[PDB]
Structure 1
Amino acid sequence: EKFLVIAGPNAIESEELLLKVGEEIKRLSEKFKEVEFVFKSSFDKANRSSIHSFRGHGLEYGVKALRKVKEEFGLKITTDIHESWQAEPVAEVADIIQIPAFLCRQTDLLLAAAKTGRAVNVKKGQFLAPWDTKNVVEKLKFGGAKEIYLTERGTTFGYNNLVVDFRSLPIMKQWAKVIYDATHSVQLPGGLGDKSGGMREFIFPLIRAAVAVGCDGVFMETHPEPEKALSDASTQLPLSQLEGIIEAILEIREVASKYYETI
Structure 2
Amino acid sequence: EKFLVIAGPCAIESEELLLKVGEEIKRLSEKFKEVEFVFKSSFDKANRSSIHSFRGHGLEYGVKALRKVKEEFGLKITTDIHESWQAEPVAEVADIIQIPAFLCRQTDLLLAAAKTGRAVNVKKGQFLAPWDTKNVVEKLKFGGAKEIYLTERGTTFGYNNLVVDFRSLPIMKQWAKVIYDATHSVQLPGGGMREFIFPLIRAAVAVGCDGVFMETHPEPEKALSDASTQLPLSQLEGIIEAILEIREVASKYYETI
TM-score (norm 2): 1.00
Question: SS at the partner of 2:209?
Answer: coil
Aligned partner of 2:92 in structure 1 is 92
CA distance, structure 1, for counterparts of residue 248 and residue 68 of structure 2:
34
Kindly provide the CA deviation profile for residues 61-117 of structure 1, in whole angstroms up to 9, marking residues without a partner as x.
000000000000000000000000000000000000000000000000000000000
Aligned pairs for 1:46-85 within 5 A:
46-85=46-85
Cα distance, 1:217 vs. partner?
0.1
Between the aligned residues of both structures, percent identity stands at 100
Kindly provide the CA deviation profile for residues 35-63 of structure 1, in whole angstroms up to 9, marking residues without a partner as x.
00000000000000000000000000000
Question: SS at the partner of 1:149?
Answer: strand
Question: SS at the partner of 2:38?
Answer: strand
Cα distance, 1:185 vs. partner?
0.2
Kindly provide the CA deviation profile for residues 219-248 of structure 1, in whole angstroms up to 9, marking residues without a partner as x.
000000000000000100000000000000
Aligned partner (choices 235, 250, 257) of residue 256 of structure 1: 250
Cα distance, 1:155 vs. partner?
0.1
Cα distance, 1:134 vs. partner?
0.2
Aligned partner of 1:164 in structure 2 is 164
CA distance, structure 2, for counterparts of residue 204 and residue 244 of structure 1:
10
Structure 1: which 4+ aligned runs deviate by more than 6 Å? none
CA distance, structure 1, for counterparts of residue 229 and residue 132 of structure 2:
27
Cα distance, 1:139 vs. partner?
0.1
CA distance, structure 2, for counterparts of residue 22 and residue 189 of structure 1:
28
Question: SS at the partner of 1:202?
Answer: helix
Aligned partner (choices 218, 223, 231) of residue 229 of structure 1: 223
CA distance, structure 2, for counterparts of residue 47 and residue 89 of structure 1:
20
CA distance, structure 1, for counterparts of residue 217 and residue 165 of structure 2:
27
TM-score (norm 1): 0.98
Aligned partner of 1:195 in structure 2 is none
Kindly provide the CA deviation profile for residues 111-163 of structure 1, in whole angstroms up to 9, marking residues without a partner as x.
00000000000000000000010000000000000000000000000000000
CA RMSD of aligned residues (A): 0.2
Question: SS at the partner of 2:48?
Answer: coil
CA distance, structure 2, for counterparts of residue 24 and residue 245 of structure 1:
14
Aligned partner of 1:215 in structure 2 is 209
CA distance, structure 1, for counterparts of residue 198 and residue 117 of structure 2:
34
Aligned pairs for 1:168-247 within 5 A:
168-191=168-191, 198-247=192-241
Question: SS at the partner of 1:188?
Answer: coil
Cα distance, 1:13 vs. partner?
0.1
> What is the aligned length?
257
CA distance, structure 2, for counterparts of residue 189 and residue 66 of structure 1:
28
Cα distance, 1:206 vs. partner?
0.1
Aligned partner of 1:194 in structure 2 is none
Kindly provide the CA deviation profile for residues 187-223 of structure 1, in whole angstroms up to 9, marking residues without a partner as x.
00000xxxxxx00000000000000000000000000
CA distance, structure 2, for counterparts of residue 187 and residue 232 of structure 1:
8
CA distance, structure 2, for counterparts of residue 133 and residue 170 of structure 1:
12
